[PDB]
Amino acid sequence: ITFIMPMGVFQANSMDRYTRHAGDFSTVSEQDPRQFPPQGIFFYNKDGI
Amino acid sequence: HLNRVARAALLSDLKRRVCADMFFMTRHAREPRLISAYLSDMVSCTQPSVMVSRITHTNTRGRQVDGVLVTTATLKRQLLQGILQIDDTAADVPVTARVPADLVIVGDKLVFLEALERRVYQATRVAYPLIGNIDITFIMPMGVFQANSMDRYTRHAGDFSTVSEQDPRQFPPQGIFFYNKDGILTQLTLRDAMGTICHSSLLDVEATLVALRQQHLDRQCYFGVYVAEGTEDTLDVQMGRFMETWADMMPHHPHWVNEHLTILQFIAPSNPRLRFELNPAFDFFVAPGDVDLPGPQRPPEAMPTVNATLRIINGNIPVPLCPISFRDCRGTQLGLGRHTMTPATIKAVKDTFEDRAYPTIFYMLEAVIHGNERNFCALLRLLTQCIRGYWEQSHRVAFVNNFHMLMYITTYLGNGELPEVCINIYRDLLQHVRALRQTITDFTIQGEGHNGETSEALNNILTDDTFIAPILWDCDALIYRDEAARDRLPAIRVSGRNGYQALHFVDMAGHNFQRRDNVLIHGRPVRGDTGQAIPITPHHDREWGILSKIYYYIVIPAFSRGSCCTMGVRYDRLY
Amino acid sequence: HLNRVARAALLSDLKRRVCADMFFMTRHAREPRLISAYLSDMVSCTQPS
């Protein structure tokens, strides 16, 4: 079985840059380290790592 | 014979099987299906044996029993209550007969469920087996912190807020919480580390130096691992041949400069400096063989060895290993309630520091006065006029460089000679400095001194007498340094010759600009007599050195950000 | 005769067993499995005669 895995897709729509709750992932930095476009993908190994 | 790759896959299979189940029966006690699956796997995991039998053991029906399982009655009851099914109460047994004996079906084959604990091992002094025990190693990190700014993320931004302006959450971790065996909260504090790290065994690096001395050591750069002596000169041609040698003595990029690597980049196996980090308190570097430090101007060439020095500063570890973000976090943690600098004073200080068009007249005055109270006592009007003229033309506070010039201003020129804003800025900077000193005092413990060293000098570095400021104008700090320790082996070197003379009150009649010996101009005391044989006394108390070192090592570098430079002066041309 | 430390470990076992079960019938009334476990422990705790 061959898997498919997108790597760097970005949401251009300003409508779609929405969250579950506004302050979900915030930091002490003035600028959220979240506005930035994605550059990596995370998944699990077969043992859960 | 599935070779290496599949043997390692099998190895990982055993890894996960071991990690998954050692106490499974008490683990998934509320999931009856899992226990049945594990028993079915166990019974269907061993190959059978020879089927030979003349008269065998069977149930009452007649079907032959096929095995026996041994445990203690506790798991007999726990399995029999709701997990496994009764087959019968008795069985047919040979006599070389009907005997009550439980038996249970699992998988597809019938097996005895024996927990023989009652017919034997009572009122006898032999311990029951199957009570083996176990010894597991548990791992607890203590103070691991995340350097990445992206990793300082939470589930909800407003999870844990307080009435304090600053979150009591930015602070790095210093304790670990876990549960006792009965469920009670347990806490480990950083004070508990003294049982392991706070011993004398920290300085047994002799074995590692001897062991690492016998590896492949090639010839490398001798710039950062060599110390020389002064060549008894006016420091000009010294710089000359220094630059001439320096421009071409590089064999490659130094191993102690490439601080730009991250943790991952520094930890890459191709990193040559990966192997040169052994002890957190020790710096290991390559040094020549049979060379006494300090050596001559030209380093002798021989087989390079390994030499190690103690890390006095906790920040001497590379910045990949000591993140700047962590340093900022703990620095914010330090002065939570301490005095801060007003926006006016900070903007003025930064603007005057980054003033490229700074006139050299102030530098002339600072060099001529050379941090002497006698000089300042006669230039009140000139200094006032100069500072006023430089200030009310671009709103920049001057005369900030020389530390023996600001306190003179705030003391003498403090009743209203200068504009109220300037003296306010000087006083606010002094308040920041004394707040830093008070913070130093708070974080040290008093009442404990060893070998005649006070607690302040025993804990902090800026309070230590042995360490000296980058620039010294008088001989008071040198006297304090070479009098305070008396156990630290001292070696003072002033451009060649060892030891100073400290001759003060030099005039135009005996100016002698071409002096090469160890006569140090201590300067004329104001509230005293110069004389010729009068012993040299410090111009100020010991706290003066503390304030000077604190200012030079805190205020100057934090504002300049590695832009200002220290250099000598040419009095033969200036005068 | 497991001396002082193990006697105190047993003492803490008594502590937890006392705090755990004084009204278990009305406590875990919705958990039929626990009650059978308690009765099994009760009946298999006294030696015969």
Next chain:
Amino acid sequence: GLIMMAYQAYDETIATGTFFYPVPVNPLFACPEHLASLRGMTNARRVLAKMVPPIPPFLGANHHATIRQPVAYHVTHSKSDFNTLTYSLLGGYFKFTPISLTHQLRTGFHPGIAFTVVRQDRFATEQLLYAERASESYFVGQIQVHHHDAIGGVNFTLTQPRAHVDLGVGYTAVCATAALRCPLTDMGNTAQNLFFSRGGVPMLHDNVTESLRRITASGGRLNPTEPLPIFGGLRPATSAGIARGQASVCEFVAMPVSTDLQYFRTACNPRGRASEAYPPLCSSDAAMLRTAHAGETGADEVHLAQYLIRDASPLRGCLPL
């Protein structure tokens, strides 16, 4: 000497290098651009200085000076604030000596190093064993007796030999650890003292070691006896009833404050490299542990700077909270 703040080479009213010559000896005060003040300025020296600070050896080398390269890199590459920068510089300006470390640990300051804790346990283990029907052949001999004279009378000893043979093709029996019951050991918090051990190089000053020993004795649940009996193992002092069983020691192994944290999330190696210690559930904050009880079935890892790691030890579905 003198310090001049902003280097100027475009001020042509005064000749370059008329009153001062750049002779900087400080890692913090490296001035690659100020070097153009001195005569004999070439492109090669500037190219070398753009990466390497020019510091004389006859005034201290970087490896041998107290102030080193990383503090200069920190002060030259950090742009957050100035109050915070000053306090960070002050906090870095602390000695790393054991006495200083004791001072910060008793104070509350966090040194730029972390630790890991290893604790030993002993659990009562049940073994679950199934073998076979025909797994062992068991021979029996004939009973024989020996009449032996005794004190009050005589002793009759009954002797009968026998032998066992495993007539199995492969592994007949399999036994595996099954049950836990009550933990005979303690899941407590007792640091593993190092002052018991002998063999390391002593400090040249006896009073330093004595003070460190006395401060280690304070705040430690197990400590050496004051008389320090020679020619012996230095047994710990006698005590009253230990709360809930034999104490479990905890040793400390150090690492930088920024260590890959997700490594500690799973069953990792005590040394740190595949070449394993099971980590049970742990919290670096008081809040994290009590919110780890699955308040809204919710488990968290990092809030801002601390960490909350779940259980990876075999004690997952055991030990009710």
Next chain:
Amino acid sequence: EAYPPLCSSDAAMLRTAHAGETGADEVHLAQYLIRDASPLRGCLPL
């Protein structure tokens, strides 16, 4: 057709994808969490 398994574009959403409050999130601001569409729905325990 290639079956896309469960994935996240940052470490945060992948660790929150364990159904922390039974909650599967998809996008926070611009990074994404694509759930499992591969046949390994009820397999491979985490």
